[PDB]
Write an enzyme that holds these catalytic residues in place. Sequence first.
Site, PDB file in Angstrom:
ATOM      1  N   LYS A  53     -22.854  98.275  -7.462  1.00 17.34           N
ATOM      2  CA  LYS A  53     -21.657  97.903  -6.697  1.00 17.34           C
ATOM      3  C   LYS A  53     -20.426  98.717  -7.118  1.00 17.34           C
ATOM      4  O   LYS A  53     -19.350  98.148  -7.341  1.00 17.34           O
ATOM      5  CB  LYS A  53     -21.345  96.409  -6.896  1.00 17.34           C
ATOM      6  CG  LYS A  53     -22.427  95.445  -6.385  1.00 17.34           C
ATOM      7  CD  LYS A  53     -22.790  95.714  -4.935  1.00 17.34           C
ATOM      8  CE  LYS A  53     -23.465  94.495  -4.282  1.00 17.34           C
ATOM      9  NZ  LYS A  53     -24.777  94.171  -4.927  1.00 17.34           N
ATOM     10  N   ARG A  68     -36.804  86.950  -5.824  1.00 20.27           N
ATOM     11  CA  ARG A  68     -37.350  85.875  -6.654  1.00 20.27           C
ATOM     12  C   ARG A  68     -38.746  85.407  -6.256  1.00 20.27           C
ATOM     13  O   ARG A  68     -39.510  84.965  -7.104  1.00 20.27           O
ATOM     14  CB  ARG A  68     -36.390  84.672  -6.725  1.00 20.27           C
ATOM     15  CG  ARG A  68     -35.973  84.123  -5.375  1.00 20.27           C
ATOM     16  CD  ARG A  68     -34.984  82.966  -5.526  1.00 20.27           C
ATOM     17  NE  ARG A  68     -35.587  81.852  -6.256  1.00 20.27           N
ATOM     18  CZ  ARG A  68     -35.145  80.598  -6.217  1.00 20.27           C
ATOM     19  NH1 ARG A  68     -34.086  80.286  -5.482  1.00 20.27           N
ATOM     20  NH2 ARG A  68     -35.766  79.653  -6.911  1.00 20.27           N
ATOM     21  N   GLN A  83     -35.685  80.545   0.933  1.00 19.09           N
ATOM     22  CA  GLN A  83     -36.871  79.823   0.486  1.00 19.09           C
ATOM     23  C   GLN A  83     -38.035  80.775   0.242  1.00 19.09           C
ATOM     24  O   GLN A  83     -39.079  80.360  -0.273  1.00 19.09           O
ATOM     25  CB  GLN A  83     -37.296  78.768   1.509  1.00 19.09           C
ATOM     26  CG  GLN A  83     -36.254  77.677   1.795  1.00 19.09           C
ATOM     27  CD  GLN A  83     -35.134  78.158   2.704  1.00 19.09           C
ATOM     28  OE1 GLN A  83     -35.316  79.071   3.511  1.00 19.09           O
ATOM     29  NE2 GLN A  83     -33.967  77.547   2.570  1.00 19.09           N
ATOM     30  N   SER A 137     -23.077  88.552   2.310  1.00 18.80           N
ATOM     31  CA  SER A 137     -23.400  87.275   2.945  1.00 18.80           C
ATOM     32  C   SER A 137     -22.970  86.042   2.162  1.00 18.80           C
ATOM     33  O   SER A 137     -23.213  84.919   2.599  1.00 18.80           O
ATOM     34  CB  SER A 137     -24.898  87.196   3.247  1.00 18.80           C
ATOM     35  OG  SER A 137     -25.639  87.238   2.050  1.00 18.80           O
TER      36      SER A 137
HETATM   37 CL   LIG Z   1     -37.053  86.300  -2.502  1.00 19.31          CL
END
Ligand SMILES: [Cl-]
EC number: 4.1.1.23
Lengths: 214, 204
Positions: A63, A194, A173, A117
Amino acid sequence: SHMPKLMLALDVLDRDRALKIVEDVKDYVDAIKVGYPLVLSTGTEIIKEIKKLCNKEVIADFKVADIPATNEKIAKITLKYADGIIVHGFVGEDSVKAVQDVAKKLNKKVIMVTEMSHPGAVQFLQPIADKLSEMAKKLKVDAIVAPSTRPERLKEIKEIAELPVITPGVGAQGGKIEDILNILDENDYVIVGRAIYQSQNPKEEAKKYKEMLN
Amino acid sequence: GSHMPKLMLALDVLDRDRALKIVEDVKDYVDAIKVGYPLVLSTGTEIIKEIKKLCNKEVIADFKVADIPATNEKIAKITLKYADGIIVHGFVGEDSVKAVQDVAKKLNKKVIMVTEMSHPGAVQFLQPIADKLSEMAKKLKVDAIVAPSTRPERLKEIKEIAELPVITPGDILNILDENDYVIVGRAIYQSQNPKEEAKKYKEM
Ligand SMILES: [Cl-]
């Protein structure tokens, strides 16, 4: 055919864990994105090591958001081992150009954040989201980073920038995001994080998300 | 206030040995040392630990933090283990700043916001909202702001809006007080005798 590339957001803190995951997923991911929390602990050695391991593109999500002189120094040290670096456009053209000038000599990539976002983006970043994609096009950066929370908005972004886009391919999710794969092509990237790195079997997860892209 | 501002060294060198040598040399005449990514990226945050150990003065990490809250929080945790304060952008929004603040508050450490910059690129997107960023800094009660001293009159305007301490590059002094910092860099770190130079600036 026109399937986007799969980019792993390797957002772990521990370097051993990071290296384990990279080795495990290397045959299914097309790129690996690393950020400051991982890199800050031991320095850029981890980027070098990730490169000894997977032979895939490594992007530093740093960034970058300083004055030209400092941006140049950050770019030099970062692109020693990384293949690309992510910069903010909000700090202006000259700051972005400073990173580009370093990257060009190395045949490496500069990627501009044009849109974010998180809720706070609404105040100052979002009002200039189109201005940023226009600047990305003007400066001929290699790609842009933008959200996929609205497919219709993603289409608008691609149409203004006319550059490769790096965008999340799954929701909060870990499920598929609908109606974006027909917008993207083989020069775009979808990010998964993740849902892969939090698994005990990241290889199987990476395989699943790669196959999700048809 | 009408007392003297503090002196902050911008330790903008790349080499670990040199950085540590400079810090030891100037420790008795600087009030704070600012470190940036080019220095820290080579070996990671161990250099902040060693610097803090040698000077026993305030160490500020000039990391221009500019990400989503969750990532900002992570950067804040790692950075503030050894650093005493961290510099963040306000442009990416209130939640992103607050994420860093929430880490800092638990540690009694500082968050400093960039509200204004002085490179030519700042004109395009940053400068048009500079007052709003100062207002944000006030609202969020960050510990200080980073802003330019190119025009002393403007620096005064920034201080009147934010009502916060400023950290500003080294006529400017009349606008500053004991809560502010003047940043000095190359004049000290590139000197043949950094200690001598630091003492001189401290006397100004
Ligand atoms: Cl993910």
